[PDB]
A paper describes a structure:
Tpms are coiled coil dimers that form co-polymers with actin such that the Tpm polymers run along both sides of the actin filament. The stability of the Tpm polymer is dependent on the 4-helix overlap junction between adjacent dimers. The importance of this junction is highlighted by the fact that the greatest peptide divergence between Tpm isoforms lies in the N- and C-termini which generate the overlap junction. Anti-Tpm3.1 compounds (ATMs) are designed to bind to the C-terminus of the Tpm3.1 coiled coil and have activity against Tpm3.1 function in vitro and in vivo.
To better understand the effects of ATM-3507 binding on Tpm3.1 function, structural studies were undertaken. While the Tpm3.1 C-terminal peptide and the overlap complex of the two peptides in the presence or absence of ATM-3507 did not crystallize, the crystal structure of the N-terminal peptide of Tpm3.1 was solved at a resolution of 2.3 Å. The solved structure shows excellent geometry and good agreement with the x-ray diffraction data. The refined structure contains four Tpm3.1 chains that form two coiled coils. This peptide is analogous to the previously solved Tpm1.1 N-terminal peptide structure, and the structure is very similar to the Tpm1.1 coiled coil, with a root mean square deviation of 0.69 Å calculated with backbone atoms from residues 12-74 of the Tpm3.1 coiled coil. The structural similarity is perhaps surprising given that the Tpm3.1 N-terminus is coded by exon 1b, whereas the Tpm1.1 is coded by exon 1a which is shorter by 6 residues and only has 24% identity to Tpm3.1 at the N-terminus. The first 6 (including the Ala-Ser and the N-terminal residues not expressed in Tpm1.1) and last 3 residues (including the engineered Cys) are not visible in the electron density maps and are most likely disordered. Similarly, these N-terminal residues were not visible in the αTM1bZIP crystal structure, so these residues may be disordered in all Tpms containing exon 1b. Molecular dynamics simulations (MDS) were carried out on models of control Tpm3.1 N-/C-overlap junctions and also on this structure with ATM-3507 incorporated into its hydrophobic core. The N-terminal peptide showed a characteristic melting profile with no detectable difference in the presence or absence of ATM-3507.
Numbering used by the authors:
A (entry chain B): 12 to 78
B (entry chain A): 6 to 74
Write the structure that this text describes.
Amino acid sequence: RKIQVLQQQADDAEERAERLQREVEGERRAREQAEAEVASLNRRIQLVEEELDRAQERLATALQKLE
Amino acid sequence: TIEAVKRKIQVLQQQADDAEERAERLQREVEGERRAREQAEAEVASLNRRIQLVEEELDRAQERLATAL
């Protein structure tokens, strides 16, 4: 009957560890989602910077055609 | 029967100790993944501010182009 107190203690400890193991997997999923957004924004900023370079290069041809 | 109770108690206490040590390792594992997540989230916020900056530089370039024509 003292064993049932110890058996419950071991049950609770194993349960907290399993609860934390699922916490690891949930944090890893959220990490991968944020890192996937980082990749998407990296691709998006490169495209607008390319659009800007062309917009300034076009501006240069128009200004250069002015002198 | 006497030793079987002293041994059942020992095996149950070793089980809880191993589980408690596993929990400490997993707590650091959680933090390792969270640290990496919040690093990415900070870069997301930075990339959103930079994209808005480039879009403003773009609008200034397109506006002057329309004028320069």
